[PDB]
Write an enzyme that holds these catalytic residues in place. Structure first.
Site, PDB file in Angstrom:
ATOM      1  N   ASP A 207     -46.767  41.247-113.112  1.00 55.89           N
ATOM      2  CA  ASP A 207     -45.583  41.377-113.964  1.00 55.89           C
ATOM      3  C   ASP A 207     -44.980  42.774-113.780  1.00 55.89           C
ATOM      4  O   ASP A 207     -45.624  43.809-114.048  1.00 55.89           O
ATOM      5  CB  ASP A 207     -45.955  41.082-115.383  1.00 55.89           C
ATOM      6  CG  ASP A 207     -44.762  40.815-116.240  1.00 55.89           C
ATOM      7  OD1 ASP A 207     -43.725  41.456-116.015  1.00 55.89           O
ATOM      8  OD2 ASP A 207     -44.744  40.022-117.212  1.00 55.89           O
TER       9      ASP A 207
ATOM     10  N   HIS B 266     -43.198  38.091-114.775  1.00 55.35           N
ATOM     11  CA  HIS B 266     -42.918  37.864-116.175  1.00 55.35           C
ATOM     12  C   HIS B 266     -42.544  36.406-116.506  1.00 55.35           C
ATOM     13  O   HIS B 266     -42.684  35.941-117.653  1.00 55.35           O
ATOM     14  CB  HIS B 266     -41.775  38.793-116.557  1.00 55.35           C
ATOM     15  CG  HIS B 266     -41.696  39.080-118.011  1.00 55.35           C
ATOM     16  ND1 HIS B 266     -42.792  39.478-118.742  1.00 55.35           N
ATOM     17  CD2 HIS B 266     -40.668  38.971-118.887  1.00 55.35           C
ATOM     18  CE1 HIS B 266     -42.439  39.615-120.006  1.00 55.35           C
ATOM     19  NE2 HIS B 266     -41.163  39.287-120.126  1.00 55.35           N
TER      20      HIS B 266
ATOM     21  N   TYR C 286     -39.633  34.129-130.825  1.00 56.87           N
ATOM     22  CA  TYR C 286     -39.216  35.131-129.855  1.00 56.87           C
ATOM     23  C   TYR C 286     -38.834  36.298-130.739  1.00 56.87           C
ATOM     24  O   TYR C 286     -39.617  37.251-130.937  1.00 56.87           O
ATOM     25  CB  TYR C 286     -38.060  34.652-129.021  1.00 56.87           C
ATOM     26  CG  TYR C 286     -37.581  35.660-128.037  1.00 56.87           C
ATOM     27  CD1 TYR C 286     -38.298  35.897-126.911  1.00 56.87           C
ATOM     28  CD2 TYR C 286     -36.434  36.438-128.282  1.00 56.87           C
ATOM     29  CE1 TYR C 286     -37.891  36.860-126.006  1.00 56.87           C
ATOM     30  CE2 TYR C 286     -35.985  37.403-127.358  1.00 56.87           C
ATOM     31  CZ  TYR C 286     -36.721  37.608-126.209  1.00 56.87           C
ATOM     32  OH  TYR C 286     -36.349  38.560-125.248  1.00 56.87           O
TER      33      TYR C 286
ATOM     34  N   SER D 289     -42.930  37.152-123.870  1.00 56.18           N
ATOM     35  CA  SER D 289     -42.170  38.397-123.861  1.00 56.18           C
ATOM     36  C   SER D 289     -42.043  39.015-125.257  1.00 56.18           C
ATOM     37  O   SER D 289     -43.041  39.232-125.923  1.00 56.18           O
ATOM     38  CB  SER D 289     -40.805  38.055-123.289  1.00 56.18           C
ATOM     39  OG  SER D 289     -40.048  39.215-122.993  1.00 56.18           O
ATOM     40  N   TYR D 290     -40.852  39.278-125.768  1.00 61.38           N
ATOM     41  CA  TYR D 290     -40.823  39.825-127.152  1.00 61.38           C
ATOM     42  C   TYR D 290     -41.640  38.872-128.034  1.00 61.38           C
ATOM     43  O   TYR D 290     -42.393  39.274-128.943  1.00 61.38           O
ATOM     44  CB  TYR D 290     -39.387  39.988-127.707  1.00 61.38           C
ATOM     45  CG  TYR D 290     -39.276  40.970-128.882  1.00 61.38           C
ATOM     46  CD1 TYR D 290     -39.541  40.574-130.171  1.00 61.38           C
ATOM     47  CD2 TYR D 290     -38.963  42.307-128.668  1.00 61.38           C
ATOM     48  CE1 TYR D 290     -39.446  41.459-131.223  1.00 61.38           C
ATOM     49  CE2 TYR D 290     -38.881  43.238-129.730  1.00 61.38           C
ATOM     50  CZ  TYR D 290     -39.135  42.804-130.989  1.00 61.38           C
ATOM     51  OH  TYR D 290     -39.061  43.700-132.042  1.00 61.38           O
TER      52      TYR D 290
HETATM   53  C1  LIG Z   1     -35.885  34.949-124.533  1.00 62.16           C
HETATM   54  O1  LIG Z   1     -35.273  34.284-123.438  1.00 62.16           O
HETATM   55  C2  LIG Z   1     -34.685  35.010-122.459  1.00 62.16           C
HETATM   56  C3  LIG Z   1     -33.889  34.319-121.581  1.00 62.16           C
HETATM   57  C4  LIG Z   1     -33.257  35.061-120.609  1.00 62.16           C
HETATM   58  O2  LIG Z   1     -32.483  34.459-119.665  1.00 62.16           O
HETATM   59  C5  LIG Z   1     -33.236  34.027-118.539  1.00 62.16           C
HETATM   60  C6  LIG Z   1     -33.452  36.433-120.497  1.00 62.16           C
HETATM   61  C7  LIG Z   1     -34.243  37.119-121.380  1.00 62.16           C
HETATM   62  C8  LIG Z   1     -34.400  38.590-121.212  1.00 62.16           C
HETATM   63  N1  LIG Z   1     -33.725  39.245-120.259  1.00 62.16           N
HETATM   64  C9  LIG Z   1     -33.808  40.565-120.050  1.00 62.16           C
HETATM   65  N2  LIG Z   1     -33.153  41.204-119.039  1.00 62.16           N
HETATM   66  C10 LIG Z   1     -34.671  41.304-120.960  1.00 62.16           C
HETATM   67  C11 LIG Z   1     -34.841  42.757-120.890  1.00 62.16           C
HETATM   68  N3  LIG Z   1     -35.890  43.244-120.253  1.00 62.16           N
HETATM   69  C12 LIG Z   1     -35.359  40.512-121.990  1.00 62.16           C
HETATM   70  C13 LIG Z   1     -36.373  41.130-122.748  1.00 62.16           C
HETATM   71  C14 LIG Z   1     -36.163  41.511-124.037  1.00 62.16           C
HETATM   72  C15 LIG Z   1     -37.238  42.101-124.672  1.00 62.16           C
HETATM   73  C16 LIG Z   1     -38.426  42.260-124.032  1.00 62.16           C
HETATM   74 CL1  LIG Z   1     -39.740  43.029-124.876  1.00 62.16          CL
HETATM   75  C17 LIG Z   1     -38.641  41.909-122.750  1.00 62.16           C
HETATM   76  C18 LIG Z   1     -37.572  41.341-122.168  1.00 62.16           C
HETATM   77 CL2  LIG Z   1     -37.683  40.802-120.540  1.00 62.16          CL
HETATM   78  N4  LIG Z   1     -35.201  39.212-122.059  1.00 62.16           N
HETATM   79  C19 LIG Z   1     -34.874  36.405-122.371  1.00 62.16           C
END
Ligand SMILES: COc1cc(OC)cc(-c2nc(N)c(CN)c(-c3ccc(Cl)cc3Cl)n2)c1
Ligand SMILES: COc1cc(OC)cc(-c2nc(N)c(CN)c(-c3ccc(Cl)cc3Cl)n2)c1
Ligand SMILES: *[C@@H]1O[C@H](CO)[C@@H](O)[C@H](O)[C@H]1NC(C)=O
Ligand SMILES: *[C@@H]1O[C@H](CO)[C@@H](O)[C@H](O)[C@H]1NC(C)=O
Ligand SMILES: *[C@@H]1O[C@H](CO)[C@@H](O)[C@H](O)[C@H]1NC(C)=O
Ligand SMILES: *[C@@H]1O[C@H](CO)[C@@H](O)[C@H](O)[C@H]1NC(C)=O
Ligand SMILES: *[C@@H]1O[C@H](CO)[C@@H](O)[C@H](O)[C@H]1NC(C)=O
Ligand SMILES: *[C@@H]1O[C@H](CO)[C@@H](O)[C@H](O)[C@H]1NC(C)=O
Ligand SMILES: *[C@@H]1O[C@H](CO)[C@@H](O)[C@H](O)[C@H]1NC(C)=O
Ligand SMILES: *[C@H]1O[C@H](CO)[C@@H](O)[C@H](O)[C@H]1NC(C)=O
Lengths: 728, 728
Positions: A670, A702, A509, A592-593
């Protein structure tokens, strides 16, 4: 232990973890729903009884999604007709049910498509948001009072967040905060009038002849952002002939200069509110303190109690300026701040006084402050054994900050290295909830002489089932790179054998402040891969990673797509040296990331990975939203950080893909990381003559989380890895 | 020893077919572009001169995409800044070069973004369309006259067609028809006011921050259709400032009763037009004859002079009511019509009588009337040797219908069996173009005694190169199914050997009136499969296929995805009962309609196929456009044909796809068969848990035909066929 943990067991949930979700409703009682009955518990004694019968609403006629109980225990809110929106938001219907009578209310019902609802914190007033306007009910069976009239879909939001505020600032749809008296209702108002709109098809059911286009205000990086305004209205002064009167609180002039955000909103006392604010160029925030003027009726924020936070190395706070925890009288508070060495600790602030005093310190970080009493502050950190992915509860005597007690380190030291907590109102009681390495254990305690009371749930059931499965083991450890320690975890197939070579799939990640190497217990995909397919699953927390200080955390500042990408590669190389890993079979994957990083990794030309899967990857930072992207990247202008914005795309690395097998997946609905982003990845791979595999999931977002799509994508990803690693 | 025909040969066009594209320009001369000098040749003698110097237009300043030379040779149109739209439509810029001066005209230029332009049939008058209105210039350097004032993007089209009329009715963007005097401009007007819009994302180059939504008025089956009005203006009386008068022609009462289409406009004389109209239920069409009236300046269409063509067995025409070919005096004409045995033959009509008289007959079909003079009618048919995939030119002596001479059958009987043709004005001469089975061969001939004049292109160059590769060969023959002949073709690996067992690919289109088995020479994906990978690629012409009469052709009436689908399945079985095809490696693929058929087979459960590939398929007729769909399916209403629309989707068969390996490909910017169709296929498979393969092509459309997407999709498809056939 003969039989293996299977793809089907994950997908079907053969082995479920029990949990114990209570709701404190006073300082000595909690509610607990069991099956569909709501039980009331007493913490000091353990007796218990049925608050509400599972049967009470048999002839309701609508299926019930949830309930909220009023704090005086007089009414209960019934939520049905739930409809998901984005990550936290949703619409639903409500019926209120009076407990001391056994009546539903016919009179003055909440309207369908209600968007948010919350009871006052004390008593039984209600505040709701319908059609983007705020409403208040003094008594459940009476007519409500409209507080705002500006509400308009997709443009004016009173009392609920817009898309970015919801996803990146508050992590909630709510933008209302009741004072503790329930006297005042503060709220926030967003104007998206000029925010550009993302548009995407939504295909729906087969029967829809023409695809619907969805349209949502979303600030991509460097675009016009919503504006925000803050109001507090007095709830004890409403009238039916006269409109509600809202008193606005203006951001401070150091914010007003340019684009800014409303970042945190904390009631201190009955007549004092805290408001934290952040400049768009997120390295500067202001805490303001606002007081009610009994006579004037106004709220005043005195520029002299204004507190300031800045970062020299990066942005402010982990994802945002921290939350303030006020002492009872409102004259001082505690809050986590980065320190002069770069490690995050709790600072004590006195209200009209300069500076603050650090009450904790060391090479480790406080994750959170959990409760604060007259004699103690409670918090959680990863101090113990110096493990950044361990978490324990601590107690600090306030009369002498050198007196720190670990409440959790030794309750069960081999099973339990990673806790959270939930104190009762006033803190006379607490539930510990340990998440690993072992199976989750939930205990109740009395803060008096941190006495253990009862076990609440020990998942003993599941431990017995798991005895009959050949379960993997999790290794948690680290490697020394430059003179620094980076932590990794490996999930190892049962019967692990350092004398044999296993393939390895790197689970990445690695966004700013992430932690992928911890002591938590999980049953998941990687569980099936190592148990049934005998693949090692490795995660690595390198530069840019969290909870280990700013030197590691801020290293990625204004440089996304570098250090974090390099390090994953390097950790894979190391993993190789390690004699038990087939270097011809190393893979990588992420969501995601993590998809972004895997793609950039797949595209480096390193030679280390044979293949990799990228799910819902960002591909160019200009495509993701302003609040998150800008935290790290600044702004995409020649004058600020445009050149590295353009030097960090996935597309520009496309020729390098000729070297690997790549699987790219995305849901076409998404609304967070736009399908757009993989659409541009595939086109770049096309323009350069490189073959790849792909899969889109129509109408998923997403989280690609519908049961059918979730089963399908992991089944599809299992096949691709299996075949990449020549495994039947 | 020779090299094989490789994937890279095909994709890079190493082996090119030569053409001889010529434009007749009198009854004795033609233009031909050579070394990009425009040449004018003399047909009788062979001699040539420079019409336009290659040198000219070097310092022009833009690249020239095409050109068009006035008919009465004083001028030439230059097309540049060409930007394509749909299958036929595009927009462009125009310069005019006056020949008797060395001069580009600099005044009163044709505007940029012109949508359609056209020389009158004689002289040098110009009609163009710009912003959906028509403009006329009498002379190239003078002001244009504005004929229409109603044009409006996506709503009112004057003198151009809208989406369905371009695609399905006229096969051209154009909707202008000059009179032969060039006295009169006829023109149709389409009104799409209440036609729904299909909407899709278009991503562009990476630098576009937000996706654009494309919106195109597109009638899906059963929706509201554009409407059309029809006009005729007199090019001879136009005033500087005075607004032109367009006289309207009304469709006839039997069409105004409900929805109908204009399908054909054909000028009979200087003062007589013919318009064919067709009901939405395409069972009944009407030909009207309009005569200009000297006194009133009006156009009158005598009811009693109407001509009616109905069908009981299907729709009307192969795809639409056929073209009439009028006698020089405009009192009778010729036109193909289905006879009583249901075979298509030329029928002779006298304008004020009521039946027609057949002029050809037999168990074969005429495919097109190509030329008419006072003494002969020339047409193409598939008569020779009963081969329906063959094509030859015949001549009929108008003074005795049994006097028919086949003009092309015995020219080169082994090499040439598939001719098309192009006559000079008045037919004094003609170009034959053989397309197979040997290399294409182009010849020029003289009409009076029908003598060979010269060979124009014989593809000898290609002949030489090809001697150096191991080319597949083509088999063409037929099978009997339930008593009837059905033709199939097989492309066969070189050094083929019938005691060995080869894998088979079935390449299917199978649309109504299609023909996939014929005698033409092609260099294509199949050539490569057979020459490098030793795969036999078969194609088969089942019920619903064309050119063999209405019993086979209409058997699919109202029943798409039925017999046309069982039949391909049956042919494969039969091929399986050949001792040279292994029944473990039979796969099937197809584009468009063929993808629909490929998906339906894959979901039939036959067990005949191991795998297949569908590219841009229909999945549900309710999703495809009105004109074509309803033509065969009628309307999707319970009172009409809903049930079979519901029974003939791909989604309904999802559960069977588990038996097969399936690759689904679709471009995201497909304005024709929308992406939505595949989005639904993929969703049904997922809901039901079938694993399958997929690829989307960002921004590509129904031809997935940009150079890189073409390179990529066939690459992709090859890996997927090879692996399915265990071919390294
Ligand atoms: C990696 O695991 C998880 C678990 C989470 O809890 C459900 C949330 C996130 C989460 N929440 C967010 N609100 C965000 C912000 N958009 C993110 C995130 C961070 C970076 C990127 Cl490129 C995209 C996202 Cl969604 N990631 C990630
Ligand atoms: C067999 O492949 C070809 C080749 C063509 O000429 C190059 C035209 C077409 C062609 N032209 C058209 N105007 C149409 C009309 N929609 C079609 C067609 C037919 C059926 C379906 Cl389901 C889809 C299409 Cl695009 N196909 C198809
Ligand atoms: C616990 O038992 C005590 C003694 O009867 C009683 O007073 C109390 O109401 C009980 N509480 C609950 C929550 O069941
Ligand atoms: C909401 O809709 C339901 C059904 O459409 C209706 O009966 C109900 O009374 C509506 N409004 C409410 C609950 O206030
Ligand atoms: C929202 O902002 C726009 C643009 O600044 C402004 O014109 C509009 O009136 C605002 N509406 C409100 C209620 O703030
Ligand atoms: C109530 O107040 C708002 C503005 O404060 C006004 O626009 C609305 O019309 C008012 N209606 C009444 C009841 O005065
Ligand atoms: C062909 O040659 C003849 C004989 O001189 C000549 O008159 C005629 O114009 C020439 N035509 C062409 C096409 O050059
Ligand atoms: C046409 O475009 C050119 C540049 O492409 C521009 O200079 C010119 O004015 C435009 N108008 C014309 C020539 O009609
Ligand atoms: C097009 O049709 C619409 C109704 O369908 C009508 O309102 C309009 O007048 C028409 N436009 C023209 C110019 O004919
Ligand atoms: C144009 O034609 C001349 C004359 O034969 C030919 O030799 C030359 O190669 C051509 N030049 C170009 C630019 O094609």
């Amino acid at each position: 232990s003969r039989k293996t943990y299977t793809l089907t067991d994950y997908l079907k949930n053969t082995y479920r973890l029990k949990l114990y979700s209570l709701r404190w409703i006073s300082d000595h009682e909690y509610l607990y729903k069991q099956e569909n009955n709501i039980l009331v518990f007493n913490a000091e004694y353990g007796n218990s009884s049925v608050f509400l019968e599972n049967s009470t609403f048999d002839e309701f006629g609508h299926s019930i999604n949830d309930y909220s109980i009023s704090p005086d225990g007089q009414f209960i809110l019934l939520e049905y007709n739930y409809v998901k929106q984005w990550r936290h938001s949703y619409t639903a219907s409500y019926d209120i049910y009076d407990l001391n009578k056994r009546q539903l209310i016919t009179e003055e019902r909440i309207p369908n498509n209600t968007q948010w609802v919350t009871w006052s914190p004390v008593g039984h007033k209600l505040a709701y948001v319908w059609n983007n306007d705020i409403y208040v009910k003094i008594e459940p069976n009476l007519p409500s009072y409209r507080i705002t009239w500006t509400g308009k879909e997709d443009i004016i939001y009173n009392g609920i967040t817009d898309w970015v505020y919801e996803e990146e600032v508050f992590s909630a749809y709510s933008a209302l905060w009741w004072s503790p008296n329930g006297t005042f209702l503060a709220y926030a108002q967003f104007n998206d009038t000029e925010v550009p709109l993302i548009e995407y098809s939504f295909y729906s059911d087969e029967s829809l002849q023409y695809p619907k286009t969805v349209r949502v205000p979303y600030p991509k990086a460097g675009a016009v952002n919503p504006t925000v305004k803050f109001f507090v209205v007095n709830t004890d002064s409403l009238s039916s002939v006269t409109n509600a009167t809202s008193i606005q609180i203006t951001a401070p002039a150091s914010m007003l200069i340019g684009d800014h955000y409303l970042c945190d909103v904390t009631w201190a006392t009955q007549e004092r509110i805290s408001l934290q604010w952040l400049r768009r160029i997120q390295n500067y925030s202001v805490m303001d303190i606002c007081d009610y003027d009994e006579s004037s009726g106004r709220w005043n924020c005195l520029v002299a109690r204004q507190h300031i936070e800045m970062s020299t190395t990066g942005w402010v706070g982990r994802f945002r300026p921290s939350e303030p925890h006020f002492t009872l009288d409102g004259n001082s508070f505690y809050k986590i701040i980065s320190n002069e060495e770069g490690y995050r600790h709790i600072c004590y602030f006195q209200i009209d006084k300069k500076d603050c005093t650090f009450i904790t310190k060391g090479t480790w970080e406080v994750i959170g402050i959990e409760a604060l009493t007259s004699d103690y502050l409670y918090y959680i950190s990863n101090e113990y054994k110096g493990m950044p992915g361990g978490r324990n509860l601590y107690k600090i005597q306030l009369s002498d900050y050198t007196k720190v007690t670990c409440l959790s380190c030794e309750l069960n030291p081999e099973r339990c290295q990673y806790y959270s907590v939930s104190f009762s109102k006033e803190a006379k009681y607490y539930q510990l909830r340990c998440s690993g390495p072992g199976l989750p254990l939930y205990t109740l305690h009395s803060s008096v002489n941190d006495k253990g009371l009862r076990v609440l749930e020990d998942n003993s059931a599941l431990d017995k089932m798991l005895q009959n499965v050949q379960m993997p083991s999790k290794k948690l450890d680290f490697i020394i790179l430059n003179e620094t320690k980076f932590w990794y975890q490996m999930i190892l197939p049962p019967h692990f054998d350092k004398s044999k070579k296993y393939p390895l799939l790197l689970d990445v990640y690695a966004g700013p402040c992430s932690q992928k190497a911890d002591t938590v217990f999980r049953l998941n995909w990687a569980t099936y891969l190592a148990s049934t397919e005998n693949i090692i699953v490795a995660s690595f927390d390198g530069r840019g990673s969290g909870y280990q200080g700013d030197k590691i955390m801020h290293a990625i500042n204004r440089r996304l797509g570098t250090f974090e990408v390099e390090d994953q590669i390097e950790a894979a190389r190391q993993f190789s040296k390690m004699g038990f890993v087939d270097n011809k079979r190393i893979a990588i994957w992420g969501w995601s990331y993590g998809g972004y990083v895997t793609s950039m990794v797949l595209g480096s030309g390193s030679g280390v990975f044979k293949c990799g899967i990228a799910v819902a990857p960002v591909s160019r930072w200009e495509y993701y939203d302003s609040v998150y992207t800008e935290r790290y990247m600044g702004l995409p202008t020649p004058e600020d950080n445009l050149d590295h914005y353009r030097n960090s795309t996935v597309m520009s690395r496309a020729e390098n893909f000729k070297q690997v097998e790549y699987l790219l997946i995305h849901g076409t609905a998404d609304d967070n990381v736009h399908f757009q982003q993989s659409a541009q990845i595939s086109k770049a791979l096309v323009d350069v003559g490189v073959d790849f595999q792909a899969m889109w999931y129509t109408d998923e977002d997403h989280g690609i989380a519908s049961s059918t799509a979730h089963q399908h994508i992991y089944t599809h990803m299992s096949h691709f890895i299996k075949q990449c690693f020549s495994l039947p």
